[PDB]
């Protein structure tokens, strides 16, 4: 019943948008509809297996392995009856969906290194936190966080 729109993003120092983070992203997107910007799809260069790939863009695309949406309302309709839709970037897409999003999956990475939208922390409360030190596989330390709208 109903639908929850969730943002998922890896944020470095500032709002600027690591195998462990990819596992976390895989953990929280698999078996769910996914909405991404055209540039993000280009960067990934493929469809993500195990989920419905919705690419939101003003113009169509030559890749029919994914579904192309012309507006946010079209993208949400393409999610069907899914309980939760994952909005996975990029920065323009996060801007588009922030007001409609009630959940946020954030990975904070300790790297200096296009900004994530500014949001009032007063409107969001943390419902999960987990810190991980860098190790052999991961060059940096990172913190996983899930925020839900007050
Ligand atoms: C799964 O592969 C990718 C995924 C993403 C999106 C993404 C990746 N990580 C997190 N925490 N949130 C996201 N929205 C971004 C990527 O680079 C554009 C990817 O290629 C490595
Ligand atoms: Cl698949
Ligand atoms: Cl729109
Ligand atoms: Cl902004």
From TrEMBL:
It catalyses: (6S)-5,6,7,8-tetrahydrofolate + NADP(+) = 7,8-dihydrofolate + NADPH + H(+). PROSITE patterns: DHFR_1, DHFR_2. SUPFAM superfamilies: Dihydrofolate reductase-like (SSF53597). Keywords: Calcium, Metal-binding, NADP, One-carbon metabolism, Oxidoreductase. GO terms for cellular component: cytosol. One of its GO terms (molecular function) is NADP binding. Mg(2+) binds at residues 112, 140. Its EC number is 1.5.1.3. Pathway: Cofactor biosynthesis; tetrahydrofolate biosynthesis; 5,6,7,8-tetrahydrofolate from 7,8-dihydrofolate: step 1/1. GO terms for biological process: dihydrofolate metabolic process; folic acid metabolic process; one-carbon metabolic process; tetrahydrofolate biosynthetic process. InterPro entries: DHFR, DHFR-like_dom_sf, DHFR_CS, DHFR_dom. Belongs to the dihydrofolate reductase family. Key enzyme in folate metabolism. Catalyzes an essential reaction for de novo glycine and purine synthesis, and for DNA precursor synthesis. This is Dihydrofolate reductase. The gene is folA.
